[PDB]
């Protein structure tokens, strides 16, 4: 689809068998979701944002469906103010910026 | 043009008689630039994201050229770790997300 930016680019994704809402974020290297349980082992990691750094749990090789498109990759879980789909998964679904 | 997301989507912008590299960020409502001494009146503001909030100065109706595309709007200036072009200006240049 083609998404304009007059509003936040939110979409529905399915992860761990559950549905959630997330923002397509070209300004994020990674995909970060708010606290939630996910199967598998996780390693502690730190990421930076506009206001500083936070600690997150890193889960690898996780299947994520974004608007019907399949992706399998790294998902970070932690105290982010919003669920964001970063470039690591945006590239998998073939997303590009156009103008 | 069409910008792929294998790498951070950085582009050159012209603001206040200067050329700078800025990140096209669909995950940002506003445009935030690294500290720079711009003339004109401004208003104090707090913006947030991952990690917390930072204090910035808000300037209105500032002309900004992005990759040859002219735009004009609000620009926030403060201690951001990167120059960020948000949706307020992305809509003005007809930028869309496509997949």
């Amino acid at each position: 689809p083609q998404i304009t930016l007059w509003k936040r680019p939110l979409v529905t994704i399915r992860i761990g068998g559950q549905l959630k809402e997330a923002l397509l974020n070209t300004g994020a290297d990674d995909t970060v979701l708010e606290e939630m349980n996910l199967p598998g082992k996780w390693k502690p990691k730190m990421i930076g944002g506009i206001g500083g750094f936070i600690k997150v749990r890193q889960y690898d090789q996780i299947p994520v469906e974004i608007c019907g498109h399949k992706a399998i990759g790294t998902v970070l879980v932690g105290p982010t103010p919003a669920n964001i789909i970063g470039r690591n998964l945006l590239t998998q679904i073939g997303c590009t910026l156009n103008f | 043009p069409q910008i792929t997301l294998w790498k951070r989507p950085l582009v050159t912008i012209r603001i206040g008689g200067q050329l700078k590299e800025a990140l096209l960020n669909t995950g940002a409502d506003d445009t935030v630039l690294e500290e720079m001494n711009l003339p004109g009146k401004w208003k104090p503001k707090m913006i947030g994201g991952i990690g917390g909030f930072i204090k910035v100065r808000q300037y209105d109706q500032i002309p900004v050229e992005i990759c040859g595309h002219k735009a004009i709007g609000t620009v926030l200036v403060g201690p951001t770790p990167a120059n960020i072009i948000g949706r307020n200006l992305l809509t003005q240049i007809g930028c869309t997300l496509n997949f």
Partner: peptide
């Protein structure tokens, strides 16, 4: 309010 979700790894 939270409105700028820039993000990056160390």
């Amino acid at each position: 309010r939270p409105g700028n979700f820039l993000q990056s790894r160390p």
